[PDB]
Amino acid sequence: GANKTVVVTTILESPYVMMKKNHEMLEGNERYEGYCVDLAAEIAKHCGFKYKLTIVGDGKYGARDADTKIWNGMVGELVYGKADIAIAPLTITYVREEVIDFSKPFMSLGISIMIKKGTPIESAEDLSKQTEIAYGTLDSGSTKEFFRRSKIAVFDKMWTYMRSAEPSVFVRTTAEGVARVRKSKGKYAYLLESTMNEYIEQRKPCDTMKVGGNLDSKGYGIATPKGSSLGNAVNLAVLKLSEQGLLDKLKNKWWYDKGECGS
């Protein structure tokens, strides 16, 4: 048929997608800025489509309900035909790859530990061997599923603690996890992706830091409904931008060029 505007689902997560100054008087794509906003423009240019950025209604990345088997979040938007493509920090996983298509990765990450500066923790092993410092993850995302599914001893032990901790150690947004670290005087550590960890490390008031190596190795991919014709072009577009060095420049732009914690 005729060309249609591509519906892009994404999520309000700094610095991938953020509300612009003066958004209250702006409309459409102009309301937003950030890494994924820039990336969407580049992909659309190379692929020759027009698009509309739409923030996912429930504010979630995507998990499948154990009983109803219904997908929520951005994954759900794709699975149920509400969006044509997701351009977001959406982690490539086995269970997701089974139900949606992913491009080759446009950014790499690993699960990591965020602490308030001075917290006596240097590794996940350290966390699992004490009880004074609480720790948790984001809901409805790939980090929580990693711990839940892990057969690796240290991570299984961490999940056994987190799943039953009271009050809840899980948070609904990355921002909530960051606040909890910042406000708990070193008694909360947050498990999150190294990308978001490194970003927060560069923001005022510069009171957090990433410690230890990453617990795993994966990446974000641009996602489409299974078998979507958009897939092939978008995938080549990611590899081209990668080869051209544009993805490296975009990360530098949003993470470090305007970092708030010094040069």
Ligand X SMILES: N[C@@H](CCC(=O)O)C(=O)O
- Can you say which residues are annotated as belonging to the binding site for L-glutamate? 89, 91, 96, 142-143, 193
- Residue at token pair 């351009």: 87
Task: Determine if 47 is a binding residue for a copy of itself (CB under 8 A).
Answer: no
| Amino acid in the structure at residue 108 | S
Restricted to residues 145-174, the positions that interact with ligand 5PX (CB under 6 A) are: none
Both tokens of 105, joined, read 């990765």
Question: Which residue in 5, 130, 244, 252 binds a copy of itself (CB under 8 A)?
Answer: 244
Task: Determine if 193 is a binding residue for ligand X (CB under 6 A).
Answer: yes
Question: Which residue in 24, 27, 67, 98 binds a copy of itself (CB under 8 A)?
Answer: 98
CA triple 88-91-94, angle to 5 deg: 140
End-to-end Cα spacing for the chain: 52
CA triple 106-35-110, angle to 5 deg: 50
Render 132-201 in DSSP notation, one character per residue. SSEEE-BTTSHHHHHHHH--SHHHHHHHHHHHH-SS---BSSHHHHHHHHHHTTTSEEEEEEHHHHHHHT
- Judged by beta carbon distances under 5 to 8 A according to partner kind, the member of a copy of itself, ligand 5PX, Cl ion, none in contact with residue 106 is ligand 5PX
- Residue at token pair 């990453």: 214
Question: Which residue in 2, 4, 28, 132 binds Cl ion (CB under 5 A)?
Answer: 4
Give the pairing of strands 107-109 and 51-55: unpaired
- Segment near ligand 5PX (CB under 6 A); pick from 76-84, 150-158, 195-203, 239-247: 239-247
Q: State the residue number with the nearest CB to ligand 5PX.
A: 219
Restricted to residues 75-104, the positions that interact with ligand X (CB under 6 A) are: 89-91
- Judged by beta carbon distances under 5 to 8 A according to partner kind, the member of ligand X, ligand 5PX, a copy of itself, none in contact with residue 193 is ligand X
- Judged by beta carbon distances under 5 to 8 A according to partner kind, the member of Cl ion, ligand 5PX, a copy of itself, none in contact with residue 152 is a copy of itself
Per CB under 5 A, residues contacting Cl ion are 4-5, 21
